[PDB]
RNA sequence: UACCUGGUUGAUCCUGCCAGUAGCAUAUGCUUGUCUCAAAGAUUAAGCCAUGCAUGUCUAAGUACGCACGGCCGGUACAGUGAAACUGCGAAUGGCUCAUUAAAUCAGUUAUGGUUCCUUUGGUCGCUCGUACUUGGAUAACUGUGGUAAUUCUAGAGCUAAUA
RNA sequence: UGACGGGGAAUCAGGGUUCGAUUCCGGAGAGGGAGCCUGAGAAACGGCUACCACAUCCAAGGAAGGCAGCAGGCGCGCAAAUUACCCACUCCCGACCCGGGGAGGUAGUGACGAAAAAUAACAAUACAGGACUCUUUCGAGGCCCUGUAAUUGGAAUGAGUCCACUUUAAAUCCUUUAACGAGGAUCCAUUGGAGGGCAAGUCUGGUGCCAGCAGCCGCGGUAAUUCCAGCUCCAAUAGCGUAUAU
RNA sequence: CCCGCCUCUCGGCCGAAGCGUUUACUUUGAAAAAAUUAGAGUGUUCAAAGCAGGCCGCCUGGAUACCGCAGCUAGGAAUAAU
């Protein structure tokens, strides 16, 4: 059963014209704990959140009716589709796919929102949350009886529907891939089209480096070609904007509208959400307590859905799930195909360096050079002392929990406190401290490293990615987390980023990567913040808005009213 | 808008004192010696009886040439000597007043297999008829409230597809059949 | 086993022979329509698939099984008159499987184009 | 209800088309056509259950989509079309032919006519009056609007038609000593030499009859549709001949 | 108990022997009459109401050892 | 099957009500092997609603120059199948609920001689004493240029029909 | 007025009394009110125009709204079902044999209710009765019947698993039939009761006006015919107990 | 139980017809939506139901009655008002 809570809102709460009338009708309150606590000389009614029992005696009881009564969300084991283990997840619901269109999924991370594609495309039998004993796939078809999916589920058993999805852990894949771009791409074609996967997708100046050549952003582009030019009926796309810049981030969200067919069934699962709005046409939400329970709401429409989602009230349930809305020269490196020729330029003690690049600009070749490797012209900066850094692909290897990895073989002496109230706190790896590294998620594993490289001590902070595999909401998070750590420790910090909101933030100083994308390329003269996204914002010919309520960057249209007037004056983002 | 019949009725009448030590005395007589299972079996016989009495007492207050009466008593009278519970001599209206509730209890399957010999006791011919032993005239019948009017009174016999009847013995002596 | 035949029309108007079939089988299952085809066309000295029955209750009991059957003049009357689910009971034909739901969903959604545009909105 | 009704029930449905109750929900309706709502039968009941000639409701479709049927000698498509008292149903692909006649219970008949009987029919005249450079017109029960009739022709008079033509061969005058029959109320369906008429200002007329057992009876004037002159029937009857048995008689013929 | 639906307090008698102990306050129960229609007797003065459930659970499988809290 | 029984007193006969007894519907508790039927968001809130769906239609017989397919064994107005749009018709029936309404609704009855009626079915349609071997102008589908963040929004340019 | 009207429903000796939102007819309304376009037919809401009220998206320039249709969720509640399948049926619409129909049909949840009906049968042996032709009594007979005993026995069968048929748009369920399937036939029938009303303990242990049962009368203060337990029994029986309208 | 000895205008040994104080009452007759309710027929395997079905192309059902009050009608003229 669920949870209920009374509700005020501020307006039509006078609390001096109305005598009261809601605290001396509650029951609890006729007890003297005191969940409503009021006065004649007020403003608001405060109606306790763990003092109200949820039952309706004082919403009737109110003169200018303000009170309401609100769902909170609780374990409740009513249709529960899939449990994974013995004191384990719960993914309670499945989500509903529909013909021709996109399906968006947002919401935290740890939800389940990956494992809720794995029993879409047949790859899993559910145990219907019985683990022990799971029921087969008789009894599992007369479990979705009065619905759509018993007819569904049909069309996956004897493969009338074929179902490929794209993986979410994109930097593992050529360990099980070996050879070239060319080969491995295509021998499974089965649709020899070839032409628009690869111009819709900025491909085939890549394809005779290897698989295993690639970095992330060019990683995560492939991928997204390896399932679109096969023959199949239903795709799932895991985190599609991960290790992405915005300009390629439209460009991946028109060619999944390009494999719709009619008949084809697309579902994606996003946490970008600024071309949400362009990529999807109905989207379903995930509430929960993370890795406890989750459960799939109905389906909402584009426009409709996220800002359902940004308030944090679902309004087709009345369930509320949320309340909260020194110097260094210039040097060249070919590592086999082409040059980055770095001009040479200045660099701070205590301020914030952050690199605006693209899908191969040499981001992560420039963060090896700083740590003294790769260096084959004269000159060149090493620094003094010993130096952090971040690798942007962690396939780790350790022994055992991350007690022994996190706690004794970095700062056995610990430098708490002050460590750990400021930085460990917010970034609870505290309640993930019993389980094993190895067992892990994306988003467990991005969190648990940064651990190290800001718990290390060292001048030159190099940190990169901190926006891949994290949800919406320890993405802002990990701002105060990074602002508030080098600036009181007074050393200074490389930050690496994709995302447009975590770059805006923080930035004193910015580094930006001119030139041709991924052929030749240039990295310039360190500038401002406010020239140096305007300027990179017009190496993009995109133009960001803040949403003036939840301060959201928007992407306006392309030649629209707001965009030709933004591109004129050359403020591609006001007050960056 | 269905395309439907909600047509029921309930066919007994429950008693009004529920404890009188004569009316459970009567019915369980009637339940020992007539095999019957429970004794809303009885209060259905007494309800089909109550019925036909209020039929004849209703025919009973007119005038002995008004059609109705000539029409419906002739068609009541001929449904009681058609079943048997009435003698083909005695068709007048009064001698519907004299049927005992044990008329329409001897008329019953299980009565008439175990009155004309075909089981060795009346609770052997009602499990007789459960278990799809008895058939009246290649019908094979599996009620045991069949009554049996006396143009099918005369062709009561054991099924074609019987061990008691034709062949194919059943399960329990062809597994004991099989010793070795 | 035994074919016997009830009240028999035989129907100028639909080009058929209208009938109710009566099967004996006393120690079988229910018999197959094929078999009941066959039993009949040799007796009504036509060929076997221009006979079409439906609709067969076995009785209580064991025993009749009891139905109905039409037996045609020739096979081109019978594609014309017949049902087209009583014709694919035969292998006769064949319906297109979308059904019913993305049908109306194709209907729903071809209403907000227009032109040209509704044979290339799918 | 803000226009006409284009449906209607089963169980509101005559009861003289004899329906099912489990069949489906609805009836047939009647199309508009000559014969009123309550008081005719249309062609998928008189060919799906009367007859039997097609078990479904599409194959009746089938039998008069290829001109198979004739209603007074026209071919009719339509399958809900109204048809009663005297309609000439007329197959010609086996060569039956059929008038709608009601039986002594009250209902439509299956009553086969000879091949030499199908050329006429006989009408009530209803109404008479005058138009258009004095053109006398007449007007009959099943709404044919003939021009220039005899003048001796008035109205409750019975004519004999050509159904090739739609020409008054010869008609019959409302007297007393005619046969009647009745198309009506309680006494549908009985045949008898009519004996009086009642007249009254203002109201409906009470004609009574005798039957040809002699008992009697009395209908309403426009339920009085005379058949023939004298105690002569102009047309085929059904085989009860219009004669009520009581319920007495009719089980002991039953036995 | 005070009821949901209008407000008001009634009081409620808790029939079997020692079921006044599977009672938490602020619980949800709910409360038939008596059994004699408006009028309040038994040799309990003042109380028409009893109490069938307790938190969707009711006091004979709770007080059998059929159900637990 | 036109029926009564315990309770005022030390005891009795009564007026009398309470409680019993049997149907019946709404819920709820405990229970459950078969099989034919079968009500099911009315009661309180005629309160609020995400999403899919619930009304469309082409014959021999209104208008096709979309190669969209296709015959002509090829030389002429158009073979034929036909997506689209114009046109005609249906969308006023069916469904759902019971909020208003107490001579209002509704029911039997009687009347339109005080009115309308798409459709069907019969009548009428050289009754009139005054370019015709067939007349005109356009606009859609289509082609082409675009706006708007946003809709089953539609604006400009160029064609061509009618049972418009 | 917790009032849509009627056909009707539950009780019923005759009379009455009460109920009818509800599948047929007739009316009214599509959040509250208005006002209109087309049309033969509307004051249409799966049409339009505003006002009130509430709500969605927004580039804050604007755009679109109406489940008292089928399913579904919110909420209120003591109190009510699956975002399934199809035009086979029954019919309606259309220019029409040909297309369409959450109208309808079909399945699912379903102890609201209604009809049928399992949960053993028979033969032994032993014991007890019964009447006895014999027997004043001890004592007889399968020279005759009735009951019991977790004391034996081989005959019958469906619950159920499940090839097929058959049903049907295509499946399902029912019916037919092939193979498995019964000893304690653990393949284990429950819900209320035993003072009177009211069919059934004048039993064994606990508590000792406390806990409690009790519709009423009443029981409980150390032989409780009433509480709490066991045994036995006795109604009803795939059901019965309680609460409210009647 | 039924009629008879003890109204007038006139139409083919008068059917037809000028009409007589009203009503209440009664008895027949017309018209009274089907479904439900009594009820006839018929072995859904019995039954609740259902309108089917039966005989070796043929035969035959899908009845009937009640529907209060008000209206309409012809027979009666005790009892009751004027
Ligand atoms: N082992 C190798 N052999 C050959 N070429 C390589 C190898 N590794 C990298 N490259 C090339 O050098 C470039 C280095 O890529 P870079 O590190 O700039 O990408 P990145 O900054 O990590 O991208 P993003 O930050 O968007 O994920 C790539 O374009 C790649 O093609
Ligand atoms: N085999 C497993 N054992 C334990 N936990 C699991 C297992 N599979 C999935 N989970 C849990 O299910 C959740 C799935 O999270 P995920 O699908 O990655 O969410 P998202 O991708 O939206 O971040 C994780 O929190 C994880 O703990
Ligand atoms: S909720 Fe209660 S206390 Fe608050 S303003 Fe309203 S009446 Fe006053
Ligand atoms: S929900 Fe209950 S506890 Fe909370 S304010 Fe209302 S009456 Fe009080
Ligand atoms: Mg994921
Ligand atoms: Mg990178």
Same mark, same amino acid.
């Given at each position: 059963?669920?949870?209920?809570?009374?509700?005020?809102?501020?307006?039509?709460?006078?609390?001096?014209?109305?005598?009261?009338?809601?605290?001396?009708?509650?029951?609890?309150?006729?007890?003297?704990?005191?969940?409503?606590?009021?006065?004649?000389?007020?403003?608001?009614?405060?109606?306790?959140?763990?003092?109200?029992?949820?039952?309706?005696?004082?919403?009737?009881?109110?003169?200018?009716?303000?009170?309401?009564?609100?769902?909170?969300?609780?374990?409740?084991?009513?249709?529960?589709?899939?449990?994974?283990?013995?004191?384990?997840?719960?993914?309670?619901?499945?989500?509903?796919?529909?013909?021709? @269109?996109?399906?968006?999924?947002?919401?935290?991370?740890?939800?389940?929102?990956?494992?809720?594609?794995?029993?879409?495309?047949?790859?899993?039998?559910?145990?219907?949350?019985?683990?022990?004993?799971?029921? +087969?796939?008789?009894?599992?078809?007369?479990?979705?009886?009065?619905?759509?999916?018993?007819?569904?589920?049909?069309?996956?058993?004897?493969?009338?529907?074929?179902?490929?999805?794209?993986?979410?852990?994109?930097?593992?894949?050529?360990? &099980?891939?070996?050879?070239?771009?060319?080969?491995?791409?295509?021998?499974?074609?089965?649709?020899?089209?070839?032409?628009?996967?690869?111009?819709?997708?900025?491909?085939?100046?890549?394809?005779?480096?290897?698989?295993? %050549?690639?970095?992330?952003? @060019?990683?995560?582009?492939?991928?997204?070609?390896?399932?679109?030019?096969?023959?199949?009926?239903?795709?799932?796309?895991?985190?599609?904007?991960?290790?992405?810049?915005?300009? !390629?981030?439209?460009?991946?969200?028109?060619?999944?509208?390009?494999?719709?067919?009619?008949?084809?069934?697309?579902?994606?699962?996003?946490?970008?959400?600024?071309?949400?709005?362009?990529?999807?046409?109905?989207?379903?939400?995930?509430?929960?307590?993370?890795?406890?329970?989750?459960?799939?709401?109905?389906?909402?429409?584009?426009?409709?859905?996220?800002?359902?989602?940004?308030?944090?009230?679902? *309004?087709?349930?009345?369930?509320?799930?949320? +309340? &909260?809305?020194?110097?260094?020269?210039?040097?060249?490196?070919?590592?086999?195909?082409?040059?980055?020729?770095?001009?040479?330029?200045?660099?701070?003690?205590?301020?914030?360096?952050?690199?605006?690049?693209?899908?191969?600009?040499?981001?992560?070749?420039?963060?090896?050079?700083?740590?003294?490797?790769?260096?084959?012209?004269?000159?060149?900066?090493?620094?003094?002392?010993?130096?952090?850094?971040?690798?942007?692909?962690?396939?780790?290897?350790?022994?055992?929990?991350?007690?022994?990895?996190?706690?004794?073989?970095?700062?056995?002496?610990?430098?708490?406190?002050?460590?750990?109230?400021?930085?460990?706190?917010?970034?609870?790896?505290?309640?993930?401290?019993?389980?094993?590294?190895?067992?892990?998620?994306?988003?467990?594993?991005?969190?648990?490293?940064?651990?190290?490289?800001?718990?290390? *001590?060292?001048?030159?902070?190099?940190?990169?990615?901190?926006?891949?595999?994290?949800?919406?909401? !320890?993405?802002?998070?990990?701002?105060? /987390?990074?602002?508030?750590?080098?600036?009181?420790?007074?050393?200074?910090?490389?930050?690496?980023?994709?995302?447009?909101?975590?770059?805006?933030?923080?930035?004193?100083?910015?580094?930006?990567?001119?030139?041709? *994308?991924?052929?030749?390329?240039?990295?310039?003269?360190?500038?401002?913040?406010?020239?140096?996204?305007?300027?990179?914002?017009?190496?993009?010919?995109?133009?960001?808005?803040?949403?003036?309520?939840?301060?959201?960057?928007?992407?306006?249209?392309?030649?629209?009213?707001?965009?030709?007037?933004?591109?004129?004056?050359?403020?591609?983002?006001?007050?960056? | 808008?269905? &395309?439907?019949?909600?047509?029921?009725?309930?066919?007994?009448?429950?008693?009004?004192?529920?404890?009188?030590?004569?009316?459970?005395?009567?019915?369980?007589?009637?339940?020992?010696?007539?095999?019957?299972?429970?004794?809303? @079996?009885?209060?259905?016989?007494?309800?089909?009886?109550?019925?036909?009495?209020?039929?004849?007492?209703?025919?009973?207050?007119? +005038?002995?040439?008004?059609?109705?009466?000539?029409?419906?008593?002739?068609?009541?009278?001929?449904?009681?000597?058609?079943?048997?519970?009435?003698?083909?001599?005695?068709?007048?209206?009064?001698?519907?007043?004299?049927?005992?509730?044990?008329?329409?209890?001897?008329?019953?399957?299980?009565?008439?297999?175990?009155?004309?010999?075909?089981?060795?006791?009346?609770?052997?011919?009602? /499990?007789?008829?459960?278990?799809?032993?008895?058939?009246?005239?290649?019908?094979?019948?599996?009620?045991? =409230?069949?009554?049996?009017?006396?143009?099918?009174?005369?062709?009561?016999?054991?099924?074609?597809?019987?061990?008691?009847?034709?062949?194919?013995?059943?399960?329990?002596?062809?597994?004991?059949?099989?010793?070795? | 086993?035994?074919?016997?035949?009830?009240?028999?029309?035989?129907?100028?108007?639909?080009?058929?022979?209208?009938?109710?079939?009566?099967?004996?089988?006393?120690?079988?299952?229910?018999?197959?329509?094929?078999?009941?085809?066959?039993?009949?066309?040799?007796?009504?000295?036509?060929?076997?698939?221009?006979?079409?029955?439906?609709?067969?209750?076995?009785?209580?009991?064991?025993?009749?099984?009891?139905?109905?059957?039409?037996?045609? %003049?020739?096979? +081109?009357?019978?594609?014309?008159?017949?049902?087209?689910?009583?014709?694919?009971?035969?292998?006769?034909?064949?319906?297109?499987?979308?059904?019913?739901?993305?049908?109306?969903?194709?209907?729903?959604?071809?209403?907000?184009?227009?032109?040209?545009?509704?044979?290339?909105?799918? | 209800?803000?226009?006409?009704?284009?449906?209607?029930?089963?169980?509101?449905?005559?009861?003289?088309?004899?329906?099912?109750?489990?069949?489906?929900?609805?009836?047939?309706?009647? =199309?508009?056509?000559?014969?009123?709502?309550?008081?005719?039968?249309?062609?998928?009941?008189?060919?799906?259950?009367?007859?039997?000639?097609?078990?479904?409701?599409?194959?009746?479709?089938?039998?008069?989509?290829?001109?198979?049927?004739?209603?007074?000698?026209?071919?009719?498509?339509?399958?809900?079309?109204?048809?009663?008292?005297?309609?000439?149903?007329?197959?010609?692909?086996?060569?039956?032919?059929?008038?709608?006649?009601? %039986?002594?219970?009250?209902?439509?008949?299956?009553?086969?006519?000879?091949?030499?009987?199908?050329?006429?029919?006989?009408?009530?005249?209803?109404?008479?009056?005058?138009?258009?450079?004095?053109?006398?017109?007449?007007?009959?029960?099943?709404?044919?609007?003939?021009?220039?009739?005899?003048?001796?022709?008035?109205?409750?008079?019975?004519?004999?038609?050509?159904?090739?033509?739609?020409?008054?061969?010869?008609?019959?005058?409302?007297?007393?000593?005619?046969?009647?029959?009745?198309?009506?109320?309680?006494?549908?369906?009985?045949?008898?030499?009519?004996?009086?008429?009642?007249?009254?200002?203002?109201?409906?007329?009470?004609?009574?009859?005798?039957?040809?057992?002699?008992?009697?009876?009395?209908?309403?004037?426009?339920?009085?549709?005379?058949?023939?002159?004298?105690?002569?029937?102009?047309?085929?009857?059904?085989?009860?001949?219009?004669?009520?048995?009581?319920?007495?008689?009719?089980?002991?013929?039953?036995? | 108990?005070?009821?949901?639906?209008?407000?008001?307090?009634?009081?409620?008698?808790?029939?079997?022997?020692?079921?006044?102990?599977?009672?938490?306050?602020?619980? @949800?129960?709910?409360?038939?009459?008596?059994?004699?229609?408006?009028?309040?007797?038994?040799?309990?003065?003042?109380?028409?109401?009893?109490?069938?459930?307790?938190?969707?659970?009711?006091?004979?499988?709770?007080?059998?050892?059929?159900?637990?809290?």
């Amino acid at each position: 059963k669920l949870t209920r809570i009374a509700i005020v809102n501020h307006d039509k709460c006078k609390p001096k014209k109305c005598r009261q009338e809601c605290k001396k009708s509650c029951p609890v309150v006729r007890m003297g704990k005191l969940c409503i606590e009021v006065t004649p000389q007020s403003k608001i009614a405060w109606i306790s959140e763990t003092l109200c029992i949820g039952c309706g005696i004082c919403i009737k009881k109110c003169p200018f009716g303000a009170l309401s009564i609100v769902n909170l969300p609780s374990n409740l084991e009513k249709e529960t589709t899939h449990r994974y283990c013995a004191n384990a997840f719960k993914l309670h619901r499945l989500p509903i796919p529909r013909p021709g @269109e996109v399906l968006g999924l947002v919401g935290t991370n740890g939800i389940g929102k990956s494992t809720a594609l794995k029993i879409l495309a047949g790859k899993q039998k559910p145990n219907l949350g019985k683990y022990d004993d799971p029921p +087969d796939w008789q009894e599992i078809l007369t479990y979705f009886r009065g619905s759509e999916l018993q007819n569904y589920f049909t069309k996956i058993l004897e493969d009338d529907l074929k179902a490929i999805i794209k993986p979410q852990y994109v930097d593992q894949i050529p360990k &099980a891939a070996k050879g070239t771009v060319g080969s491995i791409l295509d021998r499974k074609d089965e649709t020899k089209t070839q032409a628009i996967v690869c111009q819709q997708l900025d491909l085939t100046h890549l394809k005779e480096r290897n698989v295993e %050549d690639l970095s992330g952003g @060019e990683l995560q582009r492939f991928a997204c070609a390896v399932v679109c030019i096969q023959k199949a009926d239903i795709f799932m796309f895991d985190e599609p904007s991960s290790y992405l810049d915005v300009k !390629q981030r439209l460009k991946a969200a028109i060619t999944i509208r390009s494999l719709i067919n009619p008949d084809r069934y697309i579902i994606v699962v996003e946490h970008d959400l600024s071309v949400l709005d362009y990529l999807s046409d109905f989207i379903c939400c995930l509430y929960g307590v993370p890795s406890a329970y989750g459960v799939v709401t109905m389906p909402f429409s584009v426009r409709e859905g996220i800002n359902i989602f940004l308030d944090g009230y679902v *309004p087709t349930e009345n369930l509320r799930f949320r +309340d &909260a809305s020194y110097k260094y020269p210039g040097m060249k490196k070919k590592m086999g195909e082409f040059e980055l020729a770095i001009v040479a330029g200045e660099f701070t003690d205590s301020e914030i360096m952050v690199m605006l690049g693209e899908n191969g600009t040499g981001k992560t070749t420039f963060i090896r050079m700083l740590a003294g490797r790769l260096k084959p012209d004269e000159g060149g900066e090493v620094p003094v002392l010993n130096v952090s850094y971040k690798p942007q692909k962690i396939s780790p290897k350790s022994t055992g929990s991350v007690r022994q990895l996190l706690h004794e073989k970095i700062r056995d002496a610990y430098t708490h406190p002050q460590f750990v109230t400021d930085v460990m706190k917010p970034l609870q790896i505290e309640n993930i401290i019993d389980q094993e590294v190895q067992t892990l998620s994306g988003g467990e594993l991005q969190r648990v490293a940064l651990a190290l490289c800001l718990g290390k *001590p060292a001048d030159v902070y190099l940190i990169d990615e901190p926006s891949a595999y994290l949800d919406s909401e !320890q993405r802002l998070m990990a701002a105060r /987390v990074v602002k508030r750590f080098i600036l009181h420790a007074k050393k200074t910090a490389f930050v690496v980023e994709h995302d447009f909101i975590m770059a805006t933030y923080l930035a004193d100083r910015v580094i930006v990567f001119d030139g041709v *994308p991924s052929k030749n390329t240039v990295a310039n003269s360190p500038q401002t913040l406010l020239a140096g996204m305007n300027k990179f914002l017009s190496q993009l010919e995109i133009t960001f808005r803040r949403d003036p309520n939840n301060y959201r960057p928007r992407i306006n249209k392309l030649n629209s009213i707001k965009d030709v007037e933004q591109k004129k004056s050359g403020n591609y983002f006001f007050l960056d | 808008p269905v &395309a439907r019949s909600w047509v029921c009725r309930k066919t007994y009448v429950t008693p009004r004192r529920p404890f009188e030590k004569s009316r459970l005395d009567q019915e369980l007589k009637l339940i020992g010696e007539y095999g019957l299972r429970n004794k809303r @079996e009885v209060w259905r016989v007494k309800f089909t009886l109550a019925k036909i009495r209020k039929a004849a007492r209703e025919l009973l207050t007119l +005038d002995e040439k008004d059609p109705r009466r000539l029409f419906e008593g002739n068609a009541l009278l001929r449904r009681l000597v058609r079943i048997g519970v009435l003698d083909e001599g005695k068709m007048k209206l009064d001698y519907i007043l004299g049927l005992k509730i044990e008329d329409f209890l001897e008329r019953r399957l299980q009565t008439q297999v175990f009155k004309l010999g075909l089981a060795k006791s009346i609770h052997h011919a009602r /499990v007789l008829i459960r278990q799809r032993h008895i058939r009246v005239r290649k019908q094979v019948v599996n009620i045991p =409230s069949f009554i049996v009017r006396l143009d099918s009174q005369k062709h009561i016999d054991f099924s074609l597809r019987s061990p008691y009847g034709g062949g194919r013995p059943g399960r329990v002596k062809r597994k004991n059949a099989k010793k070795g | 086993v035994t074919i016997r035949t009830r009240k028999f029309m035989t129907n100028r108007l639909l080009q058929r022979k209208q009938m109710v079939i009566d099967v004996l089988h006393p120690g079988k299952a229910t018999v197959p329509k094929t078999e009941i085809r066959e039993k009949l066309a040799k007796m009504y000295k036509t060929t076997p698939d221009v006979i079409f029955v439906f609709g067969f209750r076995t009785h209580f009991g064991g025993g009749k099984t009891t139905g109905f059957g039409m037996i045609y %003049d020739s096979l +081109d009357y019978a594609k014309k008159n017949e049902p087209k689910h009583r014709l694919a009971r035969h292998g006769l034909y064949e319906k297109k499987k979308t059904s019913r739901k993305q049908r109306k969903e194709r209907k729903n959604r071809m209403k907000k184009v227009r032109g040209t545009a509704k044979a290339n909105v799918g | 209800a803000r226009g006409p009704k284009k449906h209607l029930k089963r169980v509101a449905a005559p009861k003289h088309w004899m329906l099912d109750k489990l069949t489906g929900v609805f009836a047939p309706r009647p =199309s508009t056509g000559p014969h009123k709502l309550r008081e005719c039968l249309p062609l998928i009941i008189f060919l799906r259950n009367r007859l039997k000639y097609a078990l479904t409701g599409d194959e009746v479709k089938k039998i008069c989509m290829q001109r198979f049927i004739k209603i007074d000698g026209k071919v009719r498509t339509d399958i809900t079309y109204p048809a009663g008292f005297m309609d000439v149903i007329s197959i010609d692909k086996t060569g039956e032919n059929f008038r709608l006649i009601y %039986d002594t219970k009250g209902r439509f008949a299956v009553h086969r006519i000879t091949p030499e009987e199908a050329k006429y029919k006989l009408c009530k005249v209803r109404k008479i009056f005058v138009g258009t450079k004095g053109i006398p017109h007449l007007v009959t029960h099943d709404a044919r609007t003939i021009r220039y009739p005899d003048p001796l022709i008035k109205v409750n008079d019975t004519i004999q038609i050509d159904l090739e033509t739609g020409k008054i061969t010869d008609f019959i005058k409302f007297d007393t000593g005619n046969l009647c029959m009745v198309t009506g109320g309680a006494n549908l369906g009985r045949i008898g030499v009519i004996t009086n008429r009642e007249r009254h200002p203002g109201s409906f007329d009470v004609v009574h009859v005798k039957d040809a057992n002699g008992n009697s009876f009395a209908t309403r004037l426009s339920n009085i549709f005379v058949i023939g002159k004298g105690n002569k029937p102009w047309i085929s009857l059904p085989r009860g001949k219009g004669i009520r048995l009581t319920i007495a008689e009719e089980r002991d013929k039953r036995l | 108990v005070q009821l949901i639906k209008n407000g008001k307090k009634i009081t409620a008698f808790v029939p079997n022997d020692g079921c006044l102990n599977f009672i938490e306050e602020n619980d @949800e129960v709910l409360v038939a009459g008596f059994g004699r229609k408006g009028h309040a007797v038994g040799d309990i003065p003042g109380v028409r109401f009893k109490v069938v459930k307790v938190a969707n659970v009711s006091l004979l499988a709770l007080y059998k050892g059929k159900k637990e809290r």
